[PDB]
Amino acid sequence: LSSAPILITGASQRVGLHCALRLLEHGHRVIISYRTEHASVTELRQAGAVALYGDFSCETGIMAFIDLLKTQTSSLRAVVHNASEWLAETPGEEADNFTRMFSVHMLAPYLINLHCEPLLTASEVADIVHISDDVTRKGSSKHIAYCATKAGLESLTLSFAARFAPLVKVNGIAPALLMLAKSALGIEPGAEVIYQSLRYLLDSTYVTGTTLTVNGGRHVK
Amino acid sequence: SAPILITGASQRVGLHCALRLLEHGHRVIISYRTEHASVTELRQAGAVALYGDFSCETGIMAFIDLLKTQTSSLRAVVHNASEWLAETPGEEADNFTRMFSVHMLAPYLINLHCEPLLTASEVADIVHISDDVTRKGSSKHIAYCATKAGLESLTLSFAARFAPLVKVNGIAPALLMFSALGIEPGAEVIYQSLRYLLDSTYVTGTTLTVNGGRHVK
Amino acid sequence: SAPILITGASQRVGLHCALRLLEHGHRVIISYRTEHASVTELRQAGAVALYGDFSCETGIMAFIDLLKTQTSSLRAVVHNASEWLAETPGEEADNFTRMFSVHMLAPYLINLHCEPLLTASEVADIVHISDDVTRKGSSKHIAYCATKAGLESLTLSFAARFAPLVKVNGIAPALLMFQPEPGAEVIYQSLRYLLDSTYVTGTTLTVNGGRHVK
Amino acid sequence: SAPILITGASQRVGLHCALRLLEHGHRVIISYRTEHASVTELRQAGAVALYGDFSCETGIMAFIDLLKTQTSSLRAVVHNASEWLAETPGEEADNFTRMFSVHMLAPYLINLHCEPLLTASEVADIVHISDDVTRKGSSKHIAYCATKAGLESLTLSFAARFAPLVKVNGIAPALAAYRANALAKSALGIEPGAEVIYQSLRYLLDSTYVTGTTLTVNGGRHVK
């Protein structure tokens, strides 16, 4: 196991929390970002995670987080971009909400990846994993702005895989975040399924530029 | 009867498309961000020219307000406005946000706010002009590519929301060219694509790739 | 002014496209699997009507020979011939093979053997008509869908091999296997777009009423 | 205790995957075309080695019958059998038909006729091993590529049909001049070993919420 830590952003979210806890259990040092002090952050601190405040809603918050991260570590085993914000398209607030989702889903991973490249290449095996949403396959009549920002994130996978090769592998996981009768398998998944996707990507040596779909066959249903 | 809006029509591709639409008898409104001989050419050819700064939310909403004073109906909206910026060190966030605003925020707000203008037309279309770069991604133009990918998402999503009254489609040109075929493309290929989409009754949620077979070469 | 070949064109969509091409002023060759009133309609309209049995290599090579007696050039080949067969128990392999023969073997052999006819024309196209079913797959029509997916791969590969002299593209219409017309006309307009384009190769046009967003 | 079938296990990838599965403690049945040292090795490691000729319907159906005399259940079927043939002048149709038989007809009939063996197992998987060439197409290997693309369609379609009881997924690996060129065209600049495909297989077998997907195992050739 690497002694360089893994960063998981937005790890008070259900999926992020499970992944962070399992990485700690596996033996990784883990740094998390959080935007609200909560019982889940306490759970993470008690489990061994380093908890850094990160408000990814605007450029200045992203850069403040980056500065904090660099004080904390000079190497990273991986960055897992899990931070996610779903907002309603509330009338009169559509632009604000779309910009906020752009900031969380696209601006923050781009800036963190760009600024954190030297931390990742200080590690012998280095990975970026972008966690998006399987809604991008079809689009979303309801959640237009949300979906477009997750699609932008999936583009960053292809582009950073190209730029950062060969030293850093860059991949995605696209979970059906909503998640029963609309999937093929018809079962209720635990977050464990996302952790197993993450482990597959981290432990691989020959996989980059790819995105894992984790959606119980919703697309064939 | 209703006009077709083409945004950013001082750009090479947009100028050609607007002129060709006028030649084909359409009424045309263009947006422009810079007074230029190409904008004079469009006014002289018959286009109504509206200023539009899509670099920020306030510019986008000011343009929407202006458009709505100009017309109560639209035959179509062609989102052609595009800005390619370098990833200059220290300006990456500003440039990414600006391209987000032009390529994603603007089409989304214009589409949302202009839906009643389009539905006032018997046949109504939205066309998003992206960039074939999204297929592969770009090591060099990461932010640009990502904003164009977001635009392509808007095609699927608005095609769904605006059914059955507004058809929503895309064209993805290899805007670097403006390849397997090894010819130099004129903007006419983009206009032919636009005509196919406008003239179809059926087609929605699709994106036409105009790239000279780059992806097979 | 070189002729356009459209295969399997007593099928309603092929019939429509052939007739529209003739009205547009093209010389048109059609293939047909069985003699039928619409074949005489096509003859009457100006089409050069040729028998083509795409069931097996022999039938396909017979057709290619026959074609090459008619013309030394082609403006385009439109692979429209399509056969849907049920997955009848005990006949699944025979039916899968037959659909492979019509949808994959025939376009492959025709393209390979007719490349010189196409390169004799200043502008040359191949258009593969598949079926929009390939995007999602089909629980029921597994074999049919797989053969249509194989045909779509031929677009990419022949586009690469035949560049720059022949443009190779697809049209993937929805519900083609359910056809007994806006649908046929949208296919014709897609064909016209492809034939008339100058910078488009390796692509597949989806024609499906927005089914994939619905 | 239900066995995993890997077809075409003389091949380099299938051989490795079969050996690793046996090492992991699974029972394994393999198919083979010809006797080879690799078949002896598989037998010695504990594989049940069955003859199978996937060149035509008769041979495929004979293999299915033979499998049914060997086991009343399957944990998984991994369709690894693959045939690459040159587009030899005057043999194009023969070769395209043969590759259709191995890559499309065989997995189709095997899946259709062996579904009951799979549903005898509590967790059941079908895995289609295709080839990453399908993404771009191939100027050279047109027929081969088209048969591999047909196989990838079978993933989507059997995933729909066989849900919820059987998960159906694919692995699309980047299967001398050709190697040198392909490596330079990969992003990671590594030559892969078959272990990369075994890890993909383990991910699919061990997952619970994944069906209808295809894993791309290609060193980032598509982004370079």
TrEMBL record, chain D:
<dbReference type="InterPro" id="IPR020904">
    <property type="entry name" value="Sc_DH/Rdtase_CS"/>
</dbReference>
<dbReference type="Pfam" id="PF13561">
    <property type="entry name" value="adh_short_C2"/>
</dbReference>
<protein>
    <recommendedName>
        <fullName>Dihydromonapterin reductase</fullName>
        <ecNumber>1.5.1.3</ecNumber>
        <ecNumber>1.5.1.50</ecNumber>
    </recommendedName>
</protein>
<keyword id="KW-0560">Oxidoreductase</keyword>
<dbReference type="InterPro" id="IPR036291">
    <property type="entry name" value="NAD(P)-bd_dom_sf"/>
</dbReference>
<keyword id="KW-0521">NADP</keyword>
<dbReference type="InterPro" id="IPR002347">
    <property type="entry name" value="SDR_fam"/>
</dbReference>
<keyword id="KW-0554">One-carbon metabolism</keyword>
<dbReference type="GO" id="GO:0004146">
    <property type="term" value="F:dihydrofolate reductase activity"/>
</dbReference>
<dbReference type="GO" id="GO:0006730">
    <property type="term" value="P:one-carbon metabolic process"/>
</dbReference>
<comment type="function">
    <text>Catalyzes the reduction of dihydromonapterin to tetrahydromonapterin. Also has lower activity with dihydrofolate.</text>
</comment>
<comment type="similarity">
    <text>Belongs to the short-chain dehydrogenases/reductases (SDR) family. FolM subfamily.</text>
</comment>
